[PDB]
Amino acid sequence: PKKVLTGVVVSDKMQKTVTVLVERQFPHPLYGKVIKRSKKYLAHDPEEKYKLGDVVEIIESRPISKRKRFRVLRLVESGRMDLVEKYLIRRQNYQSLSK
Template sequence: MPKRVLQGVVVSDKQDKTVVVKVERRFTHPLFKKTVRRTKHYHAHDENNQYKVGDIVWIEESRPLSKLKTWVVREAVAKA
């Protein structure tokens, strides 16, 4: 089964080797036909502490690394 890959913005880098990434998804509401935005935060592993707040990054699903971390940062799309 392929690993899921998501794109999001780093919103916190205060933890050691961990970043919090905000991922936004958009969909059309089934009844009202209006575009709705939903966001979710993911804790992702950042081995070298190289990503900072505002960076746009790709995260990839991985094995559980801790209680909250099941994602790993793959690469930065844009640096802040």
């Protein structure tokens, strides 16, 4: 079954493409305590319908481009920028680390 994922859209700046971020969770192989990690997926969106802050089902799909092997399935809830808030904040503390 073509694996599927809900993650929030996190960038629309692409032409017919969208960045989707998906926290999975699982237990640490030695320390058990469920830990949380996440990955960005490059979804396809030929209708350029989905905007930022959308939470979306994403399906494993025929390869569209170098990084796109998923397509947007369906919305799950519009207004949820608060999550993108986070992904942006995170991505901004970086700029204050270099030298």
